[PDB]
């Protein structure tokens, strides 16, 4: 029925609700004796156990159980037969011991008092209640409980009974020399005034009650030991009542004994109410026992000792389980106990130290609480906290690069409050609130079900929404999967208590059952507040390597699971050290992801080193980071990035001599390692002026205040400086200004000229900035050029792909930017782009047999290829003869389409090979991409636009020749007719999209609008009828409002509410959310 905290709570309530329990007017005393039955399992006699089990059950079952206890135990080369004592590792051992302990309970209580405490058989008592008050007060033993082999007895003695009992005890064992106090037991965890120095009478009564119970038990079966026993006496002199139960130190103080008029209200004290007069008659103070503080410390010790060799994430998960089980078990007692909180702080420090040593053998000054406590979705370890960790605003700083430039924010600088990592002690509800809330939520749910069946409707989530994570057990447990087997599952708490004898793996959640109690905690609020206290996702991803990987949004980021090298590779027969390294590969993933915030001088103070072939400064030895960075910048990728950037900029300069009046552009090639030389620099690009230019003052690229100096100049340089910025230093504007000033005012640097501009690129954060002089044209030209470069450079594409493969990240279809409105406008640049469509290729039609069955008979298709810059339409006609005799037909349709597209690119000459390809289907990317491995300068992307090449097939002549095709064919058509000569390619493409979507939405009205007069004739080598400009725009408007009306009648949306851009989006093929 109850969790052990609820058992402790009920024991406090039963003590408080006994008759006159705090009354000490007539000299009556109260005794709690807790003790342990010593060596019970060891001293069980198997013949006697067979007799007692034969009493309660079938003799075959009893004989099975005792024969099962008589076995041979082996450990390595040792063996013996167990012939005396029970085996606690059998599955039914908890049952057998609870029955045996019940017989021992009968021995301790006596049959009559046991019958009174248990109540009549037909109407048994509730726990710690009696039938009536005289039955309660008949006998000195008021409360009894046994928890496996721990027993607690609450006795109430009158003065006469106490005198008789102490008289008999001192008659048997006489000792006047005042060592019963110097040998007694008391609680050293409570205050001294919560206790006191002891007294002769109370001490004699305690040892005398212990003596009486020990006289009740026969030593051959079991005894109770004074070193196992704690006794507390509440008298007129000691107004306190002490006991421990299942981890909780409990001190009860009556309100009639408290010495203060008012009470400091605590969230950590139980207020024991009388169940008759209904006022709070006592206080219960709870602490955690030092034995349990030691148990938690040993559990963290076990984690560390077995976890020198495993991952940071498994270490964090084990810490999380330990901490959440500790706090959700103890709750108020945990925050009351001062030694437990110090232990938690020390253990959290040890866990983070383990992660630090596994990252680098030398201790740092400061890792961020960001890297430790960021949730696992953002690549953090996801640790919980039971301490108070300061989050500095130096960690909360973050910047952002937009087309305007760089924006800097210091989150937290709204307030002077210390942002802290939150505490699950604040996020978990106390036990008293849990019990009251459990009562009210189950009454509420029963009533809500009553009105639901009254009005004869459905229960809704809005009904069962407020009462969701509440109760003991939970409404959640009403909604879990199995419930019949749960009705038949009995004894699960005792079963777990004995599961320690069957399994090596200790359960920190031994006390609760998710199948029965349900999950008694929730950390959604904790995780949101952890993100907000860390400073937001943007601040966290400023700490991480999210900028360098080139992903749009942190939503839709998925981390691939990487642990299965145990099953995958142990067939190689690895060494202990080898499989430890394989177990710690997830650590290279974590280290690479959190790399910008780790190797910082402020973190690892010391003599920095420099990574070979790069310009990365390494602060301390982080070997997994070094290995990953070598795998990324292998094959001289740093210098090759510098070379590709210089080549692209010189290509832009070569195409813009006439625009900037540049006589010639020079490409210096004397220094191949100046890119990752960081002491000084030479120049990369040289500009020779055809005419004397007036340049501006030295300023940043995005500065709008140009002060053109009167100094005339003729010779210029452009210097590209690469960078791998850490989190402390990734301000590329400040870096470029400082390095430019130093490299110009320092004489070991030899620029070839006295005018120039320096562009610097931060690779770790995907940033760039420039500083220097400007003659007119530089700011706009370099802006467009560098935007296109860092969105388009293939060396940077290789770098981004390598970082993605080394993090093993995947993304949802908020993926790399497909075709949209912006790149829809950007089709019509100088680059040769080309659409590939394949949805019309593999066509199958349903044919009805003479049996009535359906056959998916294939017909011919056509690979569609469309150059929009020239309005060219290649068609590749594929036949049923090709489709014959193949399995996995759609898959090999995609693979064939890739094969013949690659064949056409092979047949194409170098001057006519396309720069960029756009595929309509997103499934074509892998086959086309691997067949264009041979042509990697081709950039292949996908389209989010659903263009109507279905309607292009639906054109009459093309469909007719596809139907009349017998062999494969390859033909070429024109789609712009003469609109290339009449109008712009932009307007021609817009008209083409309009007419093709009109043919998509209908055919009869489309062709009627295209041919409203029979005088208009479509000639041979043109596909569309010849019209004038006014006739063409009239047909355009007619098809536009036809498509708009069809969309309106299909989606029940008014036509007039759509803007021009929205109408363009329906015309293109996009989907827009409803404006209402």
């Amino acid at each position: 029925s109850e969790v052990p905290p609820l058992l402790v709570y009920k024991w406090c309530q039963g003590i408080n609700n006994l008759d006159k329990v705090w009354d000490t007017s007539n000299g009556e005393c109260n005794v709690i004796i807790e003790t342990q039955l010593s060596k019970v399992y060891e001293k069980i006699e198997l013949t006697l156990l067979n007799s007692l089990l034969r009493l309660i059950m079938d003799h075959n079952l009893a004989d099975y159980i005792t024969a099962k206890n008589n076995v041979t135990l082996t450990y390595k080369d040792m063996s013996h037969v167990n012939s005396y004592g029970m085996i606690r590792g059998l599955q039914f051992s908890a049952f057998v011991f609870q029955y045996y302990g019940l017989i021992l309970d009968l021995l301790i209580l006596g049959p009559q008092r046991a019958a009174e405490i248990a109540g009549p058989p037909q109407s048994p008592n509730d726990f710690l209640q009696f039938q009536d008050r005289d039955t309660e007060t008949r006998h000195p033993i008021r409360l009894y409980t046994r928890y496996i082999d721990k027993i607690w007895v609450f006795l109430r003695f009158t003065a006469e009974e106490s005198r008789d009992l102490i008289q008999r005890f001192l008659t048997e064992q006489p000792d006047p020399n005042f060592e019963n106090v110097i040998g007694f037991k008391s609680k050293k965890c409570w205050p001294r005034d919560s206790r006191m120095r002891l007294m002769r009478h109370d001490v004699n009564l305690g040892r005398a009650v212990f003596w009486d119970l020990k006289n009740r038990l026969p030593r051959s079966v079991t005894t109770i030991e004074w070193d196992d026993t704690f006794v507390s006496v509440y008298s007129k002199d000691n107004p306190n009542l002490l006991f421990s139960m299942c981890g909780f130190e409990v001190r009860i103080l009556p309100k009639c004994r408290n010495q203060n008029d008012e009470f400091p209200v605590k969230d950590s004290v139980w207020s024991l109410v009388d169940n008759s007069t209904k006022e709070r008659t006592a206080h219960a103070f709870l602490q955690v026992t030092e034995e349990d503080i030691q148990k938690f410390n040993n559990r963290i010790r076990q984690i560390l000792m077995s976890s020198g060799s495993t991952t940071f994430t498994k270490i964090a998960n084990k810490w999380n389980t330990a901490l959440i089980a500790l706090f959700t078990y103890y709750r108020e007692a945990a925050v009351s106990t001062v030694n437990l909180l110090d232990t938690i702080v020390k253990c959290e420090t040890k866990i983070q130290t383990r992660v630090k040593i596994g990252l680098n053998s030398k201790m740092p000054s400061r890792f961020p609480p960001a890297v430790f406590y960021t949730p696992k979705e953002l690549g953090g370890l996801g640790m919980l906290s039971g301490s108070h960790i300061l989050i500095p605003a130096s960690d909360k700083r973050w910047c952002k690069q937009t087309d305007v430039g760089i924006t800097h924010f210091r989150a937290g600088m709204s307030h002077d409050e210390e942002t802290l990592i939150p505490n699950i002690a604040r996020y978990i509800i106390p036990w008293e609130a849990e019990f009251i809330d459990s009562q009210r939520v189950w009454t509420e749910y029963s009533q809500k079900r009553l009105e639901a069946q009254q009005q004869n409707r459905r229960l809704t989530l809005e009904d069962l929404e407020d009462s969701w994570d509440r109760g003991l057990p939970r409404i959640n447990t009403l909604f879990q999967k199995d419930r019949s087997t749960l009705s038949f599952d009995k004894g699960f708490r005792a079963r777990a208590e004995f599961k320690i004898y069957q399994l090596m793996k200790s359960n920190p959640f031994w006390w609760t059952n998710p199948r029965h109690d349900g999950k008694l905690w929730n950390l959604n609020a904790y995780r949101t507040d952890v993100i907000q206290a860390l400073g937001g996702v943007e601040t966290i991803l400023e700490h991480t390597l999210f900028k360098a990987t080139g992903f749009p949004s942190w939503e839709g980021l998925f981390w691939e699971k990487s642990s299965g090298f145990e099953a995958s590779m142990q067939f190689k027969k690895l060494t202990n050290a080898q499989r430890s390294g394989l177990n710690q590969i997830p650590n290279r993933r974590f280290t690479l992801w959190w790399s910008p915030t780790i190797n910082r001088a402020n973190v690892y103070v010391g003599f920095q080193v420099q990574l070979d072939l790069t310009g990365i400064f390494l602060h301390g030895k982080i070997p997994t980071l070094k290995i990953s960075l070598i795998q990324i910048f292998r094959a001289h990728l740093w210098q090759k990035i510098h070379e590709s950037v210089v080549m692209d900029l010189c290509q832009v300069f070569d195409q813009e001599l006439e625009a900037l009046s540049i006589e010639s552009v020079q490409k210096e090639t004397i220094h191949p390692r100046k890119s990752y030389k960081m002491n000084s620099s030479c120049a990369d690009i040289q500009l020779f002026a055809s005419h004397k230019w007036n340049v501006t003052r030295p300023s940043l690229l995005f500065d709008t205040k140009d002060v053109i100096e009167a100094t005339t100049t003729n010779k210029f340089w452009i210097d590209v400086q690469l960078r791998y910025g850490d989190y402390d230093s990734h301000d590329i504007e400040r870096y470029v200004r400082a390095k430019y000033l130093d490299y110009t005012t320092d004489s070991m640097s030899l620029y070839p000229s006295p005018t120039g501009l320096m562009i610097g690129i931060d690779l770790a954060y995907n940033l760039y900035s420039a500083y220097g002089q400007y003659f007119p044209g530089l700011k706009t030209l370099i802006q467009q050029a560098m935007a296109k470069i860092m969105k388009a450079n293939p060396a940077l594409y290789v770098l981004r792909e390598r970082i993605r493969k080394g993090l093993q990240l995947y993304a949802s279809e908020s993926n790399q930017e497909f075709l949209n409105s912006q790149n829809y406008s950007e089709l019509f640049s100088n680059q040769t782009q080309l659409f590939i469509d394949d949805t019309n290729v593999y066509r199958v039609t349903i044919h009805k047999t003479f049996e009535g069955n359906l056959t998916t008979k294939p017909i011919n298709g056509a690979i569609f290829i469309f150059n929009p810059r020239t309005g060219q339409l290649f068609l590749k006609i594929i036949h049923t003869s090709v489709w014959a005799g193949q399995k996995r037909l759609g898959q090999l349709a995609k693979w064939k389409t890739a094969e013949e597209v690659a064949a056409l690119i092979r047949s194409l000459p170098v001057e006519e090979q396309p720069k960029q390809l756009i595929v309509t289907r997103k499934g074509l990317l892998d086959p086309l991409e691997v067949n264009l491995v041979d042509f990697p300068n081709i950039s292949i992307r996908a389209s989010e636009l659903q263009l109507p090449f279905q309607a292009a097939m639906k054109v009459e002549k093309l469909g007719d020749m596809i139907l009349r095709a017998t062999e494969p064919q390859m033909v070429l058509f024109n789609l712009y007719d003469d609109w290339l000569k009449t109008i712009s390619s932009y307007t021609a493409f817009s008209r083409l999209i309009l007419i093709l979507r009109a043919l998509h939405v209908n055919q009869d009205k489309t062709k009627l609008i295209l041919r409203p007069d029979k005088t208009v004739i479509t000639q041979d080598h043109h596909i569309w009828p010849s019209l004038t400009d006014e006739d063409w725009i009239k047909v355009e408007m007619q098809l536009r409002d036809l498509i708009l009306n069809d969309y309106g009648k299909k989606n029940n949306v008014n036509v007039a509410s759509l803007t021009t851009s929205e109408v363009r989006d329906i015309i293109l093929g996009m989907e827009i959310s409803a404006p209402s």
Binding site: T47, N50, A67, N70, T72
Partner: protein, 144 residues
């Protein structure tokens, strides 16, 4: 432990052994791992003999009462060992206590490989360094 140890008596039980077995099974009930060293047989031997003695006395009680007719019909109730005779699709729980099954004329391939590997493993005595030293002694002899 249950069959091949040379201290295991597989001869028929004497009358003193039977009296000791019944007397101890009355004293320490169903405790066969305890009973077996005192009797002197294995626990499975003691248990199987004890149930055989009980079934024999049951059959002699039935024969003395004469509930059944002539011993030439099919009206006899099956024995305890007959009920314990395996179902189609029932596993023996104590094949280590059952005696050994003789080799067939044609062995199967697992058994030929088992015999070959037994011979090789019994013959082998050396470790890897000792084997390399013998190999390099021969190679140095030939090189010289």
């Amino acid at each position: 432990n249950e069959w091949l140890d040379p201290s295991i008596k597989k001869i028929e039980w004497s009358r003193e052994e039977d009296e000791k077995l019944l007397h101890l099974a009355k004293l320490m009930p169903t405790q066969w791992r305890t009973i077996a060293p005192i009797v002197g047989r294995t626990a499975n031997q003691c248990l199987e003999r004890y149930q055989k003695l009980l079934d024999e006395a049951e059959q002699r009680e039935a024969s003395e009462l004469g509930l059944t007719g002539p011993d030439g019909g099919e009206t006899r109730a099956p024995t305890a060992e007959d009920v314990r005779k395996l179902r189609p699709g029932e596993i023996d729980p104590d094949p280590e206590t059952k005696p050994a099954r003789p080799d067939t004329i044609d062995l199967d391939e697992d058994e030929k490989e088992m015999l070959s590997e037994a011979r090789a493993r019994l013959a082998n005595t050396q470790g890897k360094k000792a084997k390399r030293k013998a190999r390099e002694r021969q190679q140095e002899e030939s090189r010289r």
